[PDB]
Symmetry: D2
Subunit: 228 residues, 4 copies
């Protein structure tokens, strides 16, 4: 049967993630150097709030979603499927389905919210990737993402205040000190989301936590959704 | 370090399709029974033309895109990456990236166009899946899709005329429409009966809707022209 | 170059299991209905002890091997790679390498031992498959294997006494042996009823056959002792 | 059901190769620097013939097998599954099954044949890996394998005739010329299998082709099994 051959051709890449373990989905903006060209540098409040609305929308429509992290143009989602013995998985842990629909959901909401304040902004697109993590690595994943957040934060602030040559090639600590003595800018005084991104947590409703801690010194902020 | 460790967890599902062979991407609307609940049944011209604009947008932005086929709420895209010896692959044939970005692109264009005439419509979403096919199965793929197009076409038309209980198979609902309701399915336009394709047309070049899209099973070269280069 | 191109085709199926989580490898004899056709039915002591020596050989040569379970012609191996923070993975958790080398090792030892007493026996072959499991499913895996061990055990014994047509389920063939043939299944030794495990025993250390291997469903710590390190 | 969960856990890595395209399996000896320590250097006739018997055994028991190539301690097998419209695949193109059983079959036959001439030789083990290739790349695969064969051949001959220091760091052409003027060894005069390995072809029976050509100048030697 032709339908039977095609079904096998399709099933050859019908990958499913193993169940009963943490699933991480990351959604990233495509060509967001071009897309955010024109936005307020180094940090656009309107753009960030559009991401946060997307994070909420994501957390609301994803089965098993427990925690959403945002920084720059990326969105990380922690998904668990082992709350109960009879807990089901989003799309039955189908890899291509989890990744594509997440990117779809993000795309739909982000473009809607952005074009409310910017009706002539070009279309925004996103990619999506899913994976699994052991329980003792979930907190580490977000710690990894927060460290990348701080590294990019400092660079973005130093880029919007100095020519490229000056920064080359300068450490994070250097650009931080140069921001202080030369521009009266104390990086530490910036709001949390600009320094290390923020998390969206269910409080029920999904809301932004502007007091999102440094996860490396408060791992339970993440692990409370990991070990149940 | 921690980043090295994290990089390996991610790479465990960094799947890549083997290169130099036909790639098929299918995009299907999520819960389009609810989303279309309010559209013109059995066939909505506004909704269909929103997919057609989406189909163009996809073909214009996908490296190696040769043909797009639309039917109902699904979009199949034929991608080839062996035109030359130096032909590169879209996202280097990364599985999760090809599927998601395709769904993202489809989502962006579709929602944009649909807002114009239907700003009250909720957000439309899509899923995406990618795969490879041997050269002598590409035509058979679209033939398989057209056969799924016709079976859905007859059911959609019949379910828009008769009651739920009153309606049997495809050959039954076809003559049930001819006799009982005096409606001829074979008289319907091409895109309603077996869907249509989107092909680059030359004049400069542009992606266009071909309403003279043939039955692939009776014209296999229509697809195979993009499958066999040399 | 050509090698770069070839390297990518191969890497399309260079699959790796995610690290820092339980790995299970199962090895199953190929066509062991024919290979064992000539052995002592229902249970052959020589054949079983050849698997036990194979099970030892596997555990001795597999990085992170914690427990091996034998039953019939299958061999399940529990591998952990998270003992320390610096624990490395066998073949870096390469799927095709873990499965094939396991099957190769099993093939080498088994054929060697079996030749000794049965040099007329044809070559024995095995397949191999690897996977991961969450920590709270490892015990459940072996429990699942022991439940498949008992159902096979009763059938093997019954099929060795009665005619093909004469034999119903497990509870039926169990009392059909007690009444009709006066044979008690529950009186049989452990390895025949529910298989056995191979665990490292301390005295120096060595892998040994534990004939006092309990029913895992009634003693989960027997397995979980290797699953949860801290 | 516990059996249903486990089945899903196992199916998470039940990978199948897409059908109706060339499948390549490569089997490689594990630790064959240690295993062949004691064998005749640079080329052991007995060891090579043991490989050839394995290649035959492989070609006889693998559904769809068309061509087997051997060099050093590796075995490459070309498998096709599109001879007819109703052609089936070995193990239904199950990846882990094709790779493991191939390595199993090789292991069984190789150890049997070797221990006929060397009953006290340690056990030999092998790994196995499978993949797909487009039709216009199959000939190139073996060309790639033959080029690696010649590269290793020259090095092995130069290693068994000179100390390590001398070779460092010398081209293939250099070691070839040094073999000539300094040891009266013309590499080109060596038998085919020592220079670039050989193929096992069905002639029916599977037999060694000691006249196996340089595939880069006779691609039809391979492509005759590719395009049918
Ligand atoms: N709040 C913000 N305001 C202004 N710009 C931002 C903001 N957040 C992120 N950006 C911009 O988004 C970009 C992120 O780039 P990234 O490294 O993700 O690659 P990209 O430009 O998105 O392209 P690709 O994702 O295809 O590699 C940065 O250049 C940064 O300037
Ligand atoms: N031109 C059109 N006009 C109106 N409705 C349409 C049109 N094309 C497709 N539809 C509707 O789209 C639906 C497609 O349903 P499908 O089988 O794809 O499942 P779904 O409802 O999309 O949910 P899911 O995709 O999650 O399975 C049909 O019910 C059909 O009524
Ligand atoms: N101790 C033993 N003595 C005799 N025979 C045994 C023993 N253990 C297992 N067997 C035999 O091994 C066979 C196992 O069959 P299994 O269900 O694994 O399929 P198979 O015959 O191995 O073929 P395949 O593995 O290709 O499916 C049984 O038929 C059983 O008779
Ligand atoms: N005919 C032969 N005679 C003597 N030695 C041989 C012969 N064929 C192959 N060898 C030896 O086999 C070895 C092949 O090594 P290879 O690069 O495959 O790694 P390996 O030693 O097999 O270990 P691993 O496969 O685990 O990396 C060479 O060192 C070579 O000396
Ligand atoms: Mg980006
Ligand atoms: Mg980014
Ligand atoms: Mg749909
Ligand atoms: Mg659909
Ligand atoms: Mg078996
Ligand atoms: Mg079995
Ligand atoms: Mg080797
Ligand atoms: Mg080798």
């Amino acid at each position: 049967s032709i339908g039977d051959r095609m079904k096998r051709y399709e099933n050859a890449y019908r990958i499913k993630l193993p169940e009963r373990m943490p699933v991480i989905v990351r959604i990233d903006g495509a060509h967001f150097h071009t897309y955010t060209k024109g936005c307020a540098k180094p940090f656009d409040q309107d753009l960030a709030e559009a991401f946060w609305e997307t994070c909420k929308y994501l957390a609301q429509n994803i089965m098993g979603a427990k925690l959403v992290y945002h920084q720059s143009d990326e969105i990380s989602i922690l998904i668990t499927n082992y709350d109960k013995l009879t807990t089901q998985s989003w799309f039955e842990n189908n890899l291509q389905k989890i990744a594509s629909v997440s990117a779809s959901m993000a795309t739909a909401k982000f473009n809607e919210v952005m074009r409310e304040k910017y009706p002539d902004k070009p279309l925004a697109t996103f990619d999506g990737r899913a994976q699994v993590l052991p329980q003792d690595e979930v907190a580490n994943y977000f710690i990894w993402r927060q460290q990348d957040a701080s590294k990019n934060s400092i660079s973005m602030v130093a880029q919007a205040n100095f020519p490229h040559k000056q920064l080359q090639g300068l450490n994070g600590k250097d650009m931080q000190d140069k921001l202080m003595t030369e521009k009266n800018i104390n990086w530490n005084d910036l709001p949390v989301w600009q320094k290390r991104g923020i998390c969206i947590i269910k409080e029920s409703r999904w809301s932004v936590d502007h007091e999102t801690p440094i996860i490396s010194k408060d791992r339970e902020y993440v692990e409370q959704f990991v070990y149940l």
